[PDB]
Write a protein that binds this ligand. Structure first.
Ligand SMILES: *[C@@H]1O[C@H](CO)[C@@H](O)[C@H](O)[C@H]1NC(C)=O
Lengths: 230, 213
């Protein structure tokens, strides 16, 4: 059970420098090589570069001249820097465990350079737009409590930057029949998404439904009650 | 330097059928340094296969790796509704590179969407903008047509839509259309209809409401 935790800034202005750090928690740094991977919007994966416990690092040829990768073996962390950042560098950056140190017989090298486990990921957005907190509006259910079928209600998360925004219902008590749509970039430059959930119509008068909207960039947490309109 | 090309780009098959995925390399791939990944919706890529044929721990039998040198092959013997994801192949023989990815969806019986419509909240109206949301819940196939009418007038360029990824259980999709009007234009009209056309419906279905009703 190896754990990988990462952090960094997800919003940068152009021409700035991206900085991210990954943290290995349940394993030896020495045993494995550590690599950085990014995933473009609705695209494939690109390998950035790897590093050993020895200072030695290998980079992708395309990014060789804009990359720095280091390892702080005291903290068991390895970092990634990307200089002169651009919107083309906007992607989800992942930590990963690369090849295994094998001393036999003897390569003295890292062998299976494929990545498991992966990091959770850090969505870096390259824009000069400033961060905005979201507004949460109720998507009230029309349906009468006594219709006796299924009813749908939800929350509308409007006008925020940047991504992402996580939405839960009743702190996660309710996860069944919950649909959270991927956000859409409006013409205003602000993101917007809605989270809906289908529940029995006979519980619109007993059960209380609250959506939990979190936006980490703005440090915004909102709990919204969704109740049938009178 | 080695470019990996996967085919086909998209794969649509029913559960229980054999899914054959291909991966070709621009250069020869040394000594079985080829790996396969699986990326389910909203998740990170997880190692599915490595060493060409070696099956990662926790991975079912049904997945199989094949091929050598230039052409490689990933095979899913009996597809499941949870097998719907994007599959990447990767070579570690040289400096690592991935393929463009091949997406796989699971076919199922025609599911007609359940249409819900939501009026803009009162709290929002004080902002000066009215967002009307039409919901299409649980349908297949992915393809759907949504039209907005204000007062029997077709609306164009004032809506955006979001479609969820295919569900891992029932293999359905869900869509949401958001009509954006200013508070002024919203208060001027009365009828707001959401018309939906799908292959699972005999005739288009409309959900509508009257402003301030
Ligand atoms: C690694 O640490 C995790 C989290 O503490 C713990 O659950 C697990 O037992 C450890 N992995 C193993 C099996 O060594």
């Amino acid at each position: 059970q190896v754990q990988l935790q990462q952090w960094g800034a997800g919003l940068l202005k152009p021409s700035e420098t991206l900085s991210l750090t990954c943290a290995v928690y349940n394993e030896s740094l020495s045993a494995f090589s550590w690599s950085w991977i990014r995933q473009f919007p609705g695209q494939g994966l690109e390998w950035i570069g790897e590093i050993d416990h020895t200072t030695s690092s290998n980079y992708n040829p395309s990014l060789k001249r804009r990359i720095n990768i280091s390892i702080d073996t005291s903290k068991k962390q390895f970092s990634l820097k990307l200089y002169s950042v651009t919107a083309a560098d906007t992607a989800v950056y992942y930590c990963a465990r690369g090849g295994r140190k094998v001393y036999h017989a003897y390569w003295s090298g890292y062998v299976n350079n494929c990545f498991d486990p992966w990091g959770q990921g850090t969505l870096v957005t390259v824009s000069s737009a400033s961060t905005k907190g979201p507004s949460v509006f109720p998507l009230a259910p029309s349906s009468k409590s006594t219709s006796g079928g299924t009813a749908a209600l939800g929350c509308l998360v409007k006008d925020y930057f940047p991504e992402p925004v996580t939405v839960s219902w009743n702190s996660g008590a309710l996860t069944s029949g919950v649909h959270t749509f991927p956000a859409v970039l409006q013409s205003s430059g602000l993101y917007s998404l809605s989270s809906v959930v289908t529940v029995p119509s006979s519980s619109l008068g007993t059960q209380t439904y609250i959506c939990n909207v979190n936006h980490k960039p703005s440090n915004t947490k909102v709990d919204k009650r969704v109740e049938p309109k009178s | 330097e080695i470019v990996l090309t996967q085919s086909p780009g998209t794969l649509s098959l029913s559960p229980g059928e054999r899914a054959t995925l291909s991966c070709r390399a621009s250069q020869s791939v040394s000594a079985k340094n080829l790996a396969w990944y699986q990326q389910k919706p909203g998740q990170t890529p997880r190692l599915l296969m490595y060493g060409v044929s070696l099956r990662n721990t926790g991975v079912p039998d049904r997945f199989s790796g094949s091929g050598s040198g230039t052409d490689f092959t990933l095979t899913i013997s009996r597809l499941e509704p949870e097998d719907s994801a994007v599959y990447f192949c990767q070579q570690y023989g040289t400096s690592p590179t991935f393929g463009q990815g091949t997406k796989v969806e699971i076919k199922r019986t025609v599911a007609a969407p359940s249409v819900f419509i939501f009026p803009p909240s009162d709290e929002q109206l004080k902002s000066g903008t009215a967002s009307v949301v039409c919901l299409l819940n649980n349908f297949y196939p992915r393809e759907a047509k949504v039209q907005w009418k204000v007062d029997n007038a077709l609306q164009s360029g004032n809506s955006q839509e979001s479609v969820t990824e295919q569900d891992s259980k029932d293999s359905t999709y869900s869509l949401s259309s958001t009509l954006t009007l200013s508070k002024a234009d919203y208060e001027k009209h009365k009828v707001y209809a959401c018309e939906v056309t799908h292959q699972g419906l005999s005739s288009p279905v409309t959900k509508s409401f009257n402003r301030g009703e």
